[PDB]
Each structure stands twice: as structure tokens, then as C-alpha cells.
Amino acid sequence: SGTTNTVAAYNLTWKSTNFKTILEWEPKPVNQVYTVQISTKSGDWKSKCFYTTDTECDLTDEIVKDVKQTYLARVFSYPAGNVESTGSAGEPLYENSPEFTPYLETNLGQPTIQSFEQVGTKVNVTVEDERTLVRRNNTFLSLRDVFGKDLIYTLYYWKSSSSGKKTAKTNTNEFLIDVDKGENYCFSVQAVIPSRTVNRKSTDSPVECM
Amino acid sequence: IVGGKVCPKGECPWQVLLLVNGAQLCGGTLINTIWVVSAAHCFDKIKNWRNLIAVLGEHDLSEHDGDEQSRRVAQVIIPSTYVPGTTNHDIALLRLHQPVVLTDHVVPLCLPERTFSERTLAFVRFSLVSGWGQLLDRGATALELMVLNVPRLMTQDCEASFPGKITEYMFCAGYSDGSKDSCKGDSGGPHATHYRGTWYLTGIVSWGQGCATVGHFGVYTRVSQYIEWLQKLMRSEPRPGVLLRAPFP
Amino acid sequence: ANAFLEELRPGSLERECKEEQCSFEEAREIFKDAERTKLFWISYSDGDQCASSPCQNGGSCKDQLQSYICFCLPAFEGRNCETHKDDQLICVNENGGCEQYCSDHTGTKRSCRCHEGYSLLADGVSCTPTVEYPCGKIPILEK
Numbered sequence: 293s294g295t296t297n298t299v300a301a302y303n304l305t306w307k308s309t310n311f312k313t314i315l316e317w318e319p320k321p322v323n324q325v326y327t328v329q330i331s332t333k334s335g336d337w338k339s340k341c342f343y344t345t346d347t348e349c350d351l352t353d354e355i356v357k358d359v360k361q362t363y364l365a366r367v368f369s370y371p372a373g374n375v376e377s378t379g380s381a382g383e384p385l386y387e388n389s390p391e392f393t394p395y396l397e398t399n400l401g402q403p404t405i406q407s408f409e410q411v412g413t414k415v416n417v418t419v420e421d422e423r424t425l426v427r428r429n430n431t432f433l434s435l436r437d438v439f440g441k442d443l444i445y446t447l448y449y450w451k452s453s454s455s456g457k458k459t460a461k462t463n464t465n466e467f468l469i470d471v472d473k474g475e476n477y478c479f480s481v482q483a484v485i486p487s488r489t490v491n492r493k494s495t496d497s498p499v500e501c502m
Numbered sequence: 503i504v505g506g507k508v509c510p511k512g513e514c515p516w517q518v519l520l521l522v523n524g525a526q527l528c529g530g531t532l533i534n535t536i537w538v539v540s541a542a543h544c545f546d547k548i549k550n551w552r553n554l555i556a557v558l559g560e561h562d563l564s565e566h567d568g569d570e571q572s573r574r575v576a577q578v579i580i581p582s583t584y585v586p587g588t589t590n591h592d593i594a595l596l597r598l599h600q601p602v603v604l605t606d607h608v609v610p611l612c613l614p615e616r617t618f619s620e621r622t623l624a625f626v627r628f629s630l631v632s633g634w635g636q637l638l639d640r641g642a643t644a645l646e647l648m649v650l651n652v653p654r655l656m657t658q659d660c661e662a663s664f665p666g667k668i669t670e671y672m673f674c675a676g677y678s679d680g681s682k683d684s685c686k687g688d689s690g691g692p693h694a695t696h697y698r699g700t701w702y703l704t705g706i707v708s709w710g711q712g713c714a715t716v717g718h719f720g721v722y723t724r725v726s727q728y729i730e731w732l733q734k735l736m737r738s739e740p741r742p743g744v745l746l747r748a749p750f751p
Numbered sequence: 752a753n754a755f756l757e758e759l760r761p762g763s764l765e766r767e768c769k770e771e772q773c774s775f776e777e778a779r780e781i782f783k784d785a786e787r788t789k790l791f792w793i794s795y796s797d798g799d800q801c802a803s804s805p806c807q808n809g810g811s812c813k814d815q816l817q818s819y820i821c822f823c824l825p826a827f828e829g830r831n832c833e834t835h836k837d838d839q840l841i842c843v844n845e846n847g848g849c850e851q852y853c854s855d856h857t858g859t860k861r862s863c864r865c866h867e868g869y870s871l872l873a874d875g876v877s878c879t880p881t882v883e884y885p886c887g888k889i890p891i892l893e894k
């Protein structure tokens with residue numbers, strides 16, 4: 293392959309958490325550099341990450357313009373040090389990404405228990421409503437802002453003094469649970485979008501204990 | 503045009519109708535008051551050169567409303583690399599015998615710079631294609647000018663549809679789901695691309711496999727390859743002859 | 752952490768893992784159960800991937816499991832906020848912001864140009880007609 297001027301990218305992969313969305317690919321730049329394009333399925337192609345040695349391209353700011361759209365990306369290869377040499381049709385070699393629909397596919401980040409508060413046999417447990425990369429006007433929207441009613445949380449909790457786990461679920465960021473007096477409980481939560489078919493759940497939060 | 507709609511009168515003002523002996527032949531695209539771009543293959547069967555007419559400002563072929571302007575074609579210029587009956591280099595530049603008058607109904611389409619066309623226009627997804635050609639494959643031609651928005655493919659994405667058949671002088675556009683396409687009789691008409699408020703010529707209706715055939719796209723002459731060729735000819739001292747072959751590149 | 756004689760005392764998550772760094776067995780002396788200890792440990796031992804300050808240009812870092820996310824200021828993008836959005840002014844980038852034609856030059860800012868029948872406006876990027884029927888406009892709609 294000494295006679296090759298470029299080779300197409302491959303293994304194009306979407307890495308996305310809380311809407312922070314980066315396309316990655318192979319190979320490492322070998323006598324070539326890359327440019328990415330992204331479009332919605334029926335929209336115009338916009339170029340990003342021009343003539344780069346990176347094997348990644350942040351596409352967050354494009355996909356957050358409408359998280360419910362489905363996006364297509366492609367990665368072009370250019371001969372290094374001769375990037376305008378793309379053949380007479382003006383079409384460099386490229387590869388197409390999988391389709392990506394952010395609302396459905398971005399991973400839920402690891403949640404955090406913000407606080408808990410006990411009065412007698414009752415405890416409130418509150419989950420942080422953390423920020424996403426989606427902007428509205430001059431501000432980042434929270435997970436609840438983006439997902440609304442599509443987002444729930446699940447609580448796993450246990451008494452230190454007994455085996456067995458208990459669970460609860462909430463439509464908001466808060467749980468109100470009954471507990472036995474005189475026992476120290478511990479807690480972990482997960483974010484869930486029940487309507488999803490894939491990537492439905494976050495990883496477990498850190499554990500917090502009375 | 504298959505799956506299109508009527509282009510309201512004056513909204514496709516660079517469209518040309520070509521007639522031979524008064525019968526409908528092909529489309530074309532006005533690029534200034536004396537020059538029309540069409541497809542070379544429109545001329546593969548002509549013998550009556552004296553009766554080739556271009557009509558500007560046309561809309562409804564059943565009635566002359568007054569906005570039509572008719573011109574004898576003085577010269578048809580085709581690439582030296584064009585071979586009748588073969589798809590490559592399917593472009594012709596036509597010199598009108600007398601200039602047309604630009605009006606609300608007759609306006610040229612911009613012939614873009616090549617680099618702009620390759621770097622920028624090629625990545626506008628949808629473009630308009632228009633003509634009076636067949637409404638269905640093997641069907642009837644249209645009485646009112648029809649227009650359709652079609653999305654463009656890079657050749658790698660069209661390769662599987664036409665393996666080894668799409669040259670650098672062509673590109674594909676359309677829908678492989680079969681709904682919509684240009685068709686026979688639309689040849690020579692514009693594939694026109696909008697960018698930031700102005701319309702530019704990016705393709706010429708050229709060929710396909712049937713029309714609106716599942717799995718297949720329309721194939722258009724890649725005008726970006728011909729911008730210099732066209733410009734040089736429009737500047738050149740005229741040569742005699744109704745059909746002229748001009749060196750390409 | 753373990754100092755001499757501390758381990759005579761009952762375990763305490765606050766004293767041993769919050770106020771001090773605890774080892775897995777110290778954490779296990781607290782939770783007792785293997786699976787519960789594991790669930791604590793996977794987060795506790797992960798570390799703060801933001802401690803290396805990976806977010807550039809005034810961005811803000813949010814730690815994750817074995818990863819982080821950078822929230823950028825509006826003028827920046829990238830995994831690490833390393834890309835300035837206003838600083839790739841080349842013709843292949845949205846036409847250099849030019850309305851019509853764009854030229855890259857060696858040693859100067861890109862220039863914008865206009866097609867015959869138009870002229871470049873003062874803003875350096877827009878074009879306006881200089882003739883009655885410029886190419887590529889639809890006069891019947893612009894009336």
C-alpha cells in the first residue's frame with residue numbers, strides 16, 4: 293500500500309453522555325488528516341473538525357440544536373500536506389457513521405444523591421437534577437428540563453443490620469420512604485428513561501448512608 | 503418529472519424548452535441572454551438543425567400567454583469527448599440567434615465558480631429539478647412545467663446502484679424509495695441549488711435506469727467539471743457550423 | 752486509614768472513608784456484605800477525573816465514572832473545550848461566512864467576492880444586485 297494516497301476511516305462510534313457527543317474513529321492519522329460532516333437526515337451537511345489529526349470530533353453543539361432529530365455523520369480523509377488533492381470530482385474518500393438520535397441514545401450520566409433528611413420513621417432522599425449539554429437561550433438545561441416526565445429515578449436502599457435490598461421509584465428527583473427507627477440505612481440511585489429500548493439506565497450513584 | 507408539482511409560473515424562470523420542427527425535444531437552462539446549457543444527448547438524433555428553437559418564459563404548452571420568447575438555436579457546442587449514445591460528458595452549450603429580453607419570467611441561473619460549487623453547493627442536500635418531461639416512466643409528458651426537490655448523493659453512496667457507471671463527470675440525486683425523479687424529456691433541464699439567497703446551476707438532467715426506479719437514482723451531469731469549458735466558449739470568437747465539437751478539457 | 756489502636760473501635764464510614772482514605776477491607780468492615788461493599792467501592796475508588804483540570808478555556812468539568820464531561824462557554828467546543836468556534840475562518844467552513852464566493856489566501860484573511868451582476872457590501876461578506884435581473888433571483892417573488 294505504498295501507492296495509496298488516503299484510506300477511509302472506519303469503526304465510527306458515537307460516544308455520548310448527558311448530550312456531550314463525540315464521534316470517534318480509526319485509523320490514527322497515517323499520512324492523512326480528517327474532516328467531519330454532520331447533517332440531520334433531511335438537512336444540509338455542515339463541516340466540523342477541519343483537516344485534523346484527531347480521531348475524534350465533538351459534535352455536541354450541532355446535535356443539541358434539536359435532540360429529537362436523527363443525525364448522520366461522515367469522516368473524510370485528505371492526503372497530508374496536500375489537503376486540497378481530493379480527485380477531479382472533488383470528493384475525498386469517506387465513511388458514514390451509524391445514525392444517532394440524541395434523545396434516545398445519549399447515555400445517562402452517573403447520578404448523585406444530593407441529600408437525605410429523616411424525621412422519625414420517614415426519610416426524604418433527593419437526587420441532584422444535574423445539567424446537560426443542551427442549551428436554551430444562555431443556559432444549560434437540566435436532565436429534568438430535557439426529558440420531563442420521560443425520566444424517573446430508582447432507589448436501592450438497605451438496612452445495615454439485615455440482608456435484603458429494598459427499592460422505590462419516583463417521577464421527580466425526590467423519594468419519601470419509610471424506615472425503621474434506630475437503624476442506619478444506605479442508599480444508591482439510578483436514572484431511568486423507561487420508554488427507551490436501549491441505554492435505558494444510568495450506572496448506580498455513589499452510596500450514601502445515614 | 504415524476505412525483506413533482508407544477509412550478510408556478512415565473513418561479514423556474516431559467517427553464518428553457520427546446521423544440522425541433524415544433525415538437526418538444528428537451529429542456530435547458532438559461533445562463534445569460536444568448537447562452538443556454540442543455541444535454542448533448544438531446545441532439546443525438548437531429549437532422550433538421552434549421553428548425554431547432556429554444557423557448558424562454560414558457561410554462562403551459564397549450565397556450566401562448568405572451569411571456570414566451572422563442573429563438574432559433576444558432577449553434578450547439580458539445581465536448582470533443584462526448585460520444586452519441588454513451589452517457590459521459592452529457593452537456594451542450596447553445597448559442598441563441600438573437601438575445602432574449604430578461605423579464606420577471608425570463609432570468610438566467612448563475613453559473614457558479616467551480617471551487618464554490620465543489621466545496622459549498624455540493625453539500626446543500628436538496629436541489630430543484632424541472633421540466634416538461636414524462637410524468638411516469640414510459641408515460642406522458644407534462645403540459646405545465648413541473649418541479650421536484652431531490653437530495654444529492656456523493657458518488658460512493660451511489661456506486662452500488664450503478665457500479666462502475668458513475669464517472670467524475672456525473673453525480674446522483676433522488677430517492678431510492680422510488681417516489682420521485684426526473685425522467686425522459688427532462689434532459690437538459692437544471693438541477694438548481696440554492697445558497698444564501700441565490701440559485702446556481704449544479705447539474706443537468708442526463709440519464710437514469712427508467713424513472714423513479716427502486717434502488718436507483720437520477721444521474722446528472724456534474725456541471726462543476728465544465729465551468730471553465732463553458733466560460734471559455736462564451737468568451738470565444740464564434741466558429742462556423744451549427745454543431746461544433748469543442749476540446750475538453 | 753489505620754493508626755495504632757484505632758482498629759479496636761467499630762468502623763465508621765465518616766471517620767474512616769470521608770475524613771480519611773479507606774482501603775477496601777476498611778470499607779468492608781463497615782458494610783460487612785461483599786456486594787454492598789463493592790457498590791460503595793466502585794464509586795469511592797474511581798477517583799476524580801477532573802482533578803487534572805482537563806477543561807480548557809473557562810469550561811467546567813463534571814466528574815463521571817472513569818471519565819468526565821466538559822461544559823464549555825458559548826464560544827468553544829471540543830471534548831476539552833479546546834476548539835474556538837469563531838476561529839476556523841476558511842472557505843470550507845460554511846463558505847467562510849461569505850454570501851457568494853470565497854477565496855482562501857496565503858497570509859491574509861479569506862476574502863469574499865460576488866458574481867457578475869452583484870457587488871460586495873461594506874460588511875465584507877454580503878452581495879447586492881447591480882443590475883435589474885441578476886442571475887439566480889426569482890423577481891416574481893421578490894416584488
Ligand SMILES: *C[C@@](*)(O)[C@H](CCCNC(N)=[NH2+])NC(=O)[C@H](Cc1ccccc1)NC(=O)[C@@H](Cc1ccccc1)NC(C)=O
Nearest residue numbers: 543587588589684685686687688689708709710712713720
Ligand atoms: C434525454 C433525457 O431526456 C433523458 C433523461 C432521463 C433522466 N432519467 C432519470 N431516471 N432521472 N435521458 C435519457 O433518456 C437517456 C438518454 C441518453 C443519455 C446520455 C447519453 C446518451 C443517451 N437514456 C437513459 O436515461 C436510459 C439509459 C441509457 C443511457 C445512455 C445510453 C443508453 C441507455 N434509460 C433508460 C432508458 O431507462
Ligand SMILES: *[C@@H]1O[C@H](CO)[C@@H](O)[C@H](O[C@H]2OC[C@@H](O)[C@H](O[C@H]3OC[C@@H](O)[C@H](O)[C@H]3O)[C@H]2O)[C@H]1O
Nearest residue numbers: 307799800801802803804805817818819820830
Ligand atoms: C486529567 O487531565 C488529562 C488532560 O491533561 C486528561 O487526559 C485526563 O482524562 C483522560 O484520562 C481519564 C479518562 O477518564 C478520560 O477519558 C474519559 O473521560 C473523558 C471522556 O470524554 C472519554 O470518552 C472517557 O474515555 C481521558 O480523556 C484527565 O483525567
Ligand SMILES: *[C@@H]1O[C@@H](C)[C@@H](O)[C@@H](O)[C@@H]1O
Nearest residue numbers: 809810811812822823824
Ligand atoms: C462551569 O461552567 C462553565 C460553562 C463556566 O460557566 C464556568 O465558569 C463554570 O464554573
Ligand SMILES: C[N+](C)(C)C
Nearest residue numbers: 303304305306390
Ligand atoms: C462501531 N459500531 C459499533 C458503531 C458499529
Ligand SMILES: C[N+](C)(C)C
Nearest residue numbers: 307308309312314
Ligand atoms: C465521553 N462522552 C462523549 C461520553 C461524554
Ligand SMILES: C[N+](C)(C)C
Nearest residue numbers: 333334653676677
Ligand atoms: C434525504 N433522504 C431522507 C431522502 C434520504
Ligand SMILES: C[N+](C)(C)C
Nearest residue numbers: 342343344345346
Ligand atoms: C487538528 N488539531 C486541532 C487536533 C491540531
Ligand SMILES: C[N+](C)(C)C
Nearest residue numbers: 364388389390391
Ligand atoms: C452507515 N449507516 C448509516 C448505513 C448505518
Ligand SMILES: C[N+](C)(C)C
Nearest residue numbers: 406407408409418
Ligand atoms: C437540601 N435539599 C437538597 C433538600 C435542598
Ligand SMILES: C[N+](C)(C)C
Nearest residue numbers: 438439440441442
Ligand atoms: C419531550 N418532552 C420533554 C416534552 C417530554
Ligand SMILES: C[N+](C)(C)C
Nearest residue numbers: 448457480496790
Ligand atoms: C443492585 N444495584 C444497586 C446494583 C442496582
Ligand SMILES: C[N+](C)(C)C
Nearest residue numbers: 462464466467468
Ligand atoms: C416529595 N415526594 C417525595 C412526596 C414526592
Ligand SMILES: C[N+](C)(C)C
Nearest residue numbers: 452476501764781
Ligand atoms: C453501615 N453504616 C450505616 C454505618 C454506614
Ligand SMILES: C[N+](C)(C)C
Nearest residue numbers: 562563564565566
Ligand atoms: C400553439 N399553441 C399550442 C400554443 C396554441
Ligand SMILES: C[N+](C)(C)C
Nearest residue numbers: 557566570571572
Ligand atoms: C411563438 N411564440 C411563442 C414566440 C409567439
Ligand SMILES: C[N+](C)(C)C
Nearest residue numbers: 555572573574599
Ligand atoms: C422563431 N423565429 C425564427 C421567428 C425567431
